[PDB]
Write a protein that binds this DNA or RNA. Structure first.
Ligand code: MG
Ligand code: MG
Ligand code: MG
Ligand code: MG
Ligand code: MG
Ligand code: MG
Ligand code: MG
Ligand code: MG
Ligand code: MG
Ligand code: MG
Ligand code: MG
Ligand code: MG
Ligand code: MG
Ligand code: MG
Ligand code: MG
Ligand code: MG
Ligand code: MG
Ligand code: MG
Ligand code: MG
Ligand code: MG
Ligand code: MG
Ligand code: MG
Ligand code: MG
Ligand code: MG
Ligand code: MG
Ligand code: MG
Ligand code: MG
Ligand code: MG
Ligand code: MG
Ligand code: MG
Ligand code: MG
Ligand code: MG
Ligand code: MG
Ligand code: MG
Ligand code: MG
Ligand code: MG
Ligand code: MG
Ligand code: MG
Ligand code: MG
Ligand code: MG
Ligand code: MG
Ligand code: MG
Ligand code: MG
Lengths: 60, 92, 59, 102
RNA sequence: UAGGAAGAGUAGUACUGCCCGUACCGCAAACCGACACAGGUAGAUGAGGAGAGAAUCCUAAGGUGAGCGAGAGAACUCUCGU
RNA sequence: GUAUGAGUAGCGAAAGAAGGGUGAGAAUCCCUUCCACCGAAUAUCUAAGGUUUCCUGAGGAAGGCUCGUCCGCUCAGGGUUAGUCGGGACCUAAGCCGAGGCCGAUAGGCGUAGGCGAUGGACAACAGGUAGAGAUUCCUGUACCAGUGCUAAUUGUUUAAC
RNA sequence: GAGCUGUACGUAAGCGUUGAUCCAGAGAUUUCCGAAUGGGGGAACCCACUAUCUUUAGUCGGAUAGUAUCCUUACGUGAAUACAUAGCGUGAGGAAGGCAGACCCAGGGAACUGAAACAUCUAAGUACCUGGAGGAAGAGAAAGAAAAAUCGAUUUCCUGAGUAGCGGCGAGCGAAACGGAAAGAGCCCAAACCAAGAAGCUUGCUUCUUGGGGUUGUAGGACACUCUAUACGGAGUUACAAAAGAAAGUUAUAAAUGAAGCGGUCUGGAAAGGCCCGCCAAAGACGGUAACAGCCCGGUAGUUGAAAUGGCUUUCCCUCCAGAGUGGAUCCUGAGUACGACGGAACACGUGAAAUUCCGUCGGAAUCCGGGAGGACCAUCUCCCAAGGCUAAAUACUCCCUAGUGACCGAUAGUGAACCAGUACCGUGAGGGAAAGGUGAAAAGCACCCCGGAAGGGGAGUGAAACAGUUCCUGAAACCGUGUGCCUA
């Protein structure tokens, strides 16, 4: 959690968008039948939730 | 809502894969998504030129495992055709 | 509505007895009259009972 | 539970009383412990993807934790266990050997 | 007409046009009658020979052989013919 | 829960026959020929209604008044594409709701402006193709209705084109 | 402090001593419908406007906020109609709805039944509908109770007592005070009077606002003077005026430590059981463990523990405060009310000699030498000052949370429901409403062979038991069969 509290609130948006895209490719890959690591989807989806929580509480 | 929440997943079936060489791609979209929001969602993600979009709504089937019966997820399906002078989606 | 603005007079119930005391049911009303009075400095036509109106109110 | 993965165990009761072994797994959700060489069974398994030939298999079965008590690693006898805080940590202390088990 | 007004039309090109329904049965085995029930269910089209006719008998395009059989040819019951 | 009536009544209007095929198993499933039936219907569309019953590959315990290799039955995968069709973003009838308002022990009743409400009014697309399931929707060909930008010249300016 | 990704087997892919899963406190996100509140609507759907921003060459599209009604209050605009009102718009506060099928306050209010019929009466101010709250509500500080003497706010419990009474004097209904207890707490306005302000002109007056005084009965106050106090002292957010804050302690919400038999031996599938020996006990509660355990496990007695939140107590802080006496000129002490006639209702009391309280309609006082009550009423006496308001405790109930108990049930019982129950099913709808528990200690749930398409069997193996094989502990009776000893045309 604290590993990213040092960011400057503007590269977090770049992290929001980068992780959102990766999630889409995983769903695209899983539906086709090419994904062999099905566990990765959950960590990516939690990390999206984690980053939004810090931004929300930074502005209270 | 963002372009990657309008679109959910592709559809790969016997009928869906039959029209790949015809430049028609089948997708699962959100229920509340309109025919226009899908056109701009694809243009943003895949960077192609959409020419025409068709949609249809599917009711939920009634499955039965054991003595408990329920309804399969209600779906909304869209078929997007790209113009001739537009790059093709891998989708393989 | 149907209630004196000044007092609290309004309809009330009771029995209607007769000879041999066959108890029926009935009601009692009030002398509510439609008059124009002053409520906030603005004339208005409202219900005022005749007993209340008999002393101290200006029409 | 007083026993974890890797301890050395002396059994107490059962058809297989008086033997010793090492624990291979723990199931705190049901208070059962799997010990090698203890309480073997015979599984009539149909040929499948796993072990394609199939046959009679000689594997172990879990036993209740109550039928297990830990032995002192150094001196080498079963004993009850106690918790003594030292060095900003909790360790297991034998009530008989008077020494830290771990 | 009251009103509003500095922009207006025409021609030629390219582009844009949302939500719901769309399967299937629908004089029926899928609708209303507890039933794979001799009942009921709005509207459009509804051919030929003879015929005034959507009557009547036999047929065209089209659709069917009806979700227990075979074998004897008594009394009796029902529907028919002398 | 299980008997007697008892292997009894019934098996719900109707013309089938033979030859091949599959199958462990065939009067009942598939194919062929002959015969018979309806034909202002037992034919083709389309509303209400039903809500997956539609298609393909597997199954024969239960359902099918018998049988079953079969099914509107079981399991698993699929299938419904609209500017022009019907309804909304247009309109109103019967009727319903109803700011203020009038009436009334409470609850509430009536009712103006206003708004909903098709069984009616207005409104732009036709012909062909598609052997598993959609067609005025997808594809080919040829159009129409409303709107926008970009060019082309034309034209007009506050007794003020439009 | 070592496993984890629920029920739920199992596959795949992963995460954890850099301390995960898990438990407790505090936060964040919180689609749509629903009082639903931008408009509409057939529940979870449709269609918008005003602003700011975003995208495209532009139409098209997207992001955020605001936009319901009523009540109160200020500002602005403004009709008949000259001023002004009505109306219109904006701004700020409050309300709507739900339920715990419980308790209580009010508005409205049955019949079946009893009287061996029935109408007065009873059932009954019960059932039910509606409105208002509160954790409790209601009542409450004497115009009281009572009589040879006195008591001193209200509420609840025992007796008074089935007494006095009411009653087609029928069926029936049915008190109160004294006495004994639980709990105990008292206060604030109106009016004279003073001061200030304002409007009218009631024209130097009266009628309104505020502040100060002041509230009671062998009368009190205003008014006159004496005495003292302006925080010395007193009180407080449960009434007496009200709004907050700091510190300490204590409690609830996670937890930690915690003694003593692997004792020998017998039966057994397994020992906690029998026999013989020991120990702990502020711990011999409860549950599990292959059978009945204080000494095997989770624990129990005892002793500790809280970063965070909430409650309770105390202190501090804060805030606010005049009360004693003597004279009694004069003035003040709740008016369309107190009562009365008429028609009803509640009081145990049914019009009766009917006192007391309330309602609708008419009539209509005195006011300190005054007024009310003591069960019609008059006189004497005694008690008490109505027509304004507030108030904790003793009392009633349990949709809930924690800790427990039962000479309560044990699957036709106990909740309708021990099980995916208000479910399946029935009805257009309100509504009605079931059946259904048990393998084994452990899945070790029958490898393999034979008959059969399969189901199903016979061997083999697991198991203490398979005559425990996925409705599986025990397995009665009805009912259906096979074989035989005796009898029978
Ligand atoms: Mg469509
Ligand atoms: Mg048809
Ligand atoms: Mg039917
Ligand atoms: Mg049939
Ligand atoms: Mg029929
Ligand atoms: Mg003819
Ligand atoms: Mg004809
Ligand atoms: Mg005919
Ligand atoms: Mg033909
Ligand atoms: Mg017979
Ligand atoms: Mg017969
Ligand atoms: Mg038949
Ligand atoms: Mg044949
Ligand atoms: Mg047949
Ligand atoms: Mg014919
Ligand atoms: Mg339909
Ligand atoms: Mg089918
Ligand atoms: Mg069959
Ligand atoms: Mg059959
Ligand atoms: Mg089927
Ligand atoms: Mg239309
Ligand atoms: Mg209204
Ligand atoms: Mg109305
Ligand atoms: Mg309309
Ligand atoms: Mg119509
Ligand atoms: Mg048209
Ligand atoms: Mg078809
Ligand atoms: Mg066509
Ligand atoms: Mg309320
Ligand atoms: Mg109520
Ligand atoms: Mg009270
Ligand atoms: Mg211990
Ligand atoms: Mg022993
Ligand atoms: Mg036993
Ligand atoms: Mg009277
Ligand atoms: Mg008395
Ligand atoms: Mg009170
Ligand atoms: Mg039983
Ligand atoms: Mg029961
Ligand atoms: Mg129903
Ligand atoms: Mg078998
Ligand atoms: Mg047995
Ligand atoms: Mg047992």
């Amino acid at each position: 959690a604290n590993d990213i509290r040092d960011l400057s609130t503007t590269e977090i948006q770049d992290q929001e968008k980068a992780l959102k895209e990766e999630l889409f490719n995983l769903r695209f890959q899983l539906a086709t039948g090419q994904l062999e690591n099905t566990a990765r989807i959950r960590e990516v989806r939690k990390a999206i939730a984690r980053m939004k929580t810090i931004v929300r509480e930074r502005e209270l | 809502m963002d372009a990657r929440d309008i679109i959910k997943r592709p559809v790969v079936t016997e009928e869906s894969t039959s029209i790949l060489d015809d430049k028609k791609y089948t997708f699962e979209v959100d229920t509340r998504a309109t025919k226009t929001q899908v056109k701009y969602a694809i243009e943003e993600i895949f960077d192609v030129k959409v020419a025409k979009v068709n949609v249809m709504n599917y009711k939920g089937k009634l499955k039965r495992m054991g003595r408990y019966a329920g309804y399969t997820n209600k779906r909304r399906k869209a078929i997007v055709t790209v113009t001739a002078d537009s790059k093709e989606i891998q989708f393989f | 509505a149907k209630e004196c603005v000044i007092t609290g007079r309004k309809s009330r119930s009771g029995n209607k007895r007769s000879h041999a005391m066959n108890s029926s049911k009935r009601t009692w009303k009030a002398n509510l009259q439609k008059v124009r009075i002053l409520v906030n400095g603005k004339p208005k036509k409202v219900w005022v009972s005749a007993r209340a109106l008999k002393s101290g109110k200006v029409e | 539970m007083h026993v974890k993965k890797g301890d050395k165990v002396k059994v107490i009761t059962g058809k297989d009383k008086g033997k010793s072994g090492k624990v291979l797994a723990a199931f705190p959700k049901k208070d059962r412990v799997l010990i090698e060489g203890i309480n073997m069974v015979k599984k009539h398994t149909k040929p499948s993807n796993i072990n394609p030939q199939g046959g009679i298999l000689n594997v172990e079965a879990p036993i209740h934790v109550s039928n297990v008590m830990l032995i002192d690693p150094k001196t080498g006898e079963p004993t009850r266990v106690g918790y003594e805080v030292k060095g900003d940590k909790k360790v297991r202390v034998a009530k008989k050997s008077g020494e830290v088990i771990d």
